[PDB]
Amino acid sequence: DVSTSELDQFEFWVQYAAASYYEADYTAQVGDKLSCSKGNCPEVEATGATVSYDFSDSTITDTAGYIAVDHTNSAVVLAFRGSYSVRNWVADATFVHTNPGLCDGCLAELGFWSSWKLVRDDIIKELKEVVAQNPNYELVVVGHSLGAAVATLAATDLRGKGYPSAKLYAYASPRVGNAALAKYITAQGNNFRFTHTNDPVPKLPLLSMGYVHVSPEYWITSPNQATVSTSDIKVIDGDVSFDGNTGTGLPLLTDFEAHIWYFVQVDAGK
Ligand SMILES: [Cl-]
Numbered sequence: 001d002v003s004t005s006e007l008d009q010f011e012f013w014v015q016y017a018a019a020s021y022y023e024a025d026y027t028a029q030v031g032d033k034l035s036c037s038k039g040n041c042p043e044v045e046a047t048g049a050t051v052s053y054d055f056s057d058s059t060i061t062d063t064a065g066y067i068a069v070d071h072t073n074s075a076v077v078l079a080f081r082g083s084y085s086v087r088n089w090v091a092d093a094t095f096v097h098t099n100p101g102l103c104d105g106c107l108a109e110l111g112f113w114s115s116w117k118l119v120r121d122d123i124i125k126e127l128k129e130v131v132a133q134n135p136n137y138e139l140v141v142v143g144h145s146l147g148a149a150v151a152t153l154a155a156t157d158l159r160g161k162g163y164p165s166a167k168l169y170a171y172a173s174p175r176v177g178n179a180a181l182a183k184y185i186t187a188q189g190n191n192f193r194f195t196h197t198n199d200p201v202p203k204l205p206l207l208s209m210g211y212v213h214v215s216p217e218y219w220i221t222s223p224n225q226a227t228v229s230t231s232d233i234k235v236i237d238g239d240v241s242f243d244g245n246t247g248t249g250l251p252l253l254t255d256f257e258a259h260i261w262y263f264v265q266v267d268a269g270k
Pocket residue numbers: 012043047072073
């Protein structure tokens with residue numbers, strides 16, 4: 001279980017992930033309000049948060065996102081959306097290790113790391129300016145699904161490039177690296193990683209392939225389309241690799257609908 005306060009926070013940040021699915025948001029003119037035309041980010045809209053910078057998917061990249069500023073919550077928000085071909089990723093993606101240069105022994109999944117590396121230089125330049133304009137604000141890095149994997153790696157790297165207190169909200173994330181990488185990220189702290197029932201996406205890549213999750217795990221145990229209460233989240237410390245969502249069994253495409261329902265229908269904007 002969690003406190004009401006924590007639940008309210010978790011139900012809030014996911015709405016920035018929801019916004020990242022909307023082409024209208026990630027191609028918005030800078031200064032425009034974030035908005036979700038299907039009504040799945042009402043609390044974001046209530047803050048009046050505006051876009052400071054954005055980046056679109058295109059012919060050269062499947063990753064889209066934005067940097068926004070939330071003057072209600074004193075937060076600079078970096079949101080990532082990854083490929084929306086996620087069923088195909090579960091069915092048929094191949095996973096490859098790479099050395100991201102983050103920590104001793106640490107290896108990351110090449111696809112996810114390559115996605116961050118493509119956008120890193122400009123995002124780092126832009127965050128310097130946005131934080132200079134809002135110098136007492138926190139940095140929150142957020143995503144859902146494949147975007148949550150990119151968010152995890154971005155956060156990890158940003159914490160060594162001037163943002164050590166950056167917060168990560170990674171909803172429905174795949175695993176992103178090996179045991180050494182997971183341990184290093186876990187020790188940075190400020191990590192909020194979520195899974196839902198038997199969602200197959202956080203089960204990949206597999207433990208047997210050497211990949212490990214960041215801990216703790218916030219495991220939402222309520223069903224699809226049910227409101228999450230304080231008793232519907234289990235907090236798992238990662239001491240046992242097969243506690244939590246991994247314990248529900250090998251990943252199945254027949255469980256895929258569980259991927260969509262993390263407090264709200266996160267991907268409605270696609
Ligand atoms: Cl709020």
